[PDB]
Symmetry: C2
Subunit: 132 residues, 2 copies
Amino acid sequence: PKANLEIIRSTYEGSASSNAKHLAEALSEKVEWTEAEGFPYGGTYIGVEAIMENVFSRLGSEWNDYKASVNMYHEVSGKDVIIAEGMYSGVYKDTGKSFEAEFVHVWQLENGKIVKFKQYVDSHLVREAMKS
Amino acid sequence: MPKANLEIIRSTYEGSASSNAKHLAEALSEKVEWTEAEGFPYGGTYIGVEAIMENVFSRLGSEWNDYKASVNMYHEVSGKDVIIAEGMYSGVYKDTGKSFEAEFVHVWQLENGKIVKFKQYVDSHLVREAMKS
Ligand code: NA
Ligand code: NA
């Protein structure tokens, strides 16, 4: 099997299509996916179909060029956990305002499947781009 | 020999505010660079303890009641002098009387037992909402 670090990098480091396919291939059936409360898509979603409807489809439809760029990956001692420090950027369609916001994503894997994801994000900056 | 990284970082959260502060001051390197998230009210990068206290901790103390950072997971990065803490802030903003809760991650880097870098990630919208009249 591919290393966990490689699996996680594969959800960010390629084209949008390769990233999306890689993520879907790696998600466990009952993956628990948490967007930060202050982020517009905040909440916890169980399974790929809820994640697509409530999160990724909206990142595509409400923003132009929504992008997540990782600056560091960290492998956690004594866990199957990968922590990514990164930056988001994008333009909110309704306002035309661009933003940048720093994030951390905490990924947990079991037997090489992604079983948990949690977003931490500088949500004030995201929300400011949404303000007319 | 210095104490373990994990021990040092835990000692900055797991006591009362007064001992946490003592422990942090004792562990900060002279060259520490400390970054608060841009969208957090005290956003910026601060060099050295004096700047950190002036711009960050003094204001957490003076502008809020019972500002607290509660850690839910401590992580140590394999083969690196990096500790990552996941947790929750809580507090009441004095000027509005509003309470908040917000999720954070803190990324700490050390060199030979002294903290050389800190970086805050925080759900800043929720903090900012408590500050609105
Ligand atoms: Na590990
Ligand atoms: Na106070």
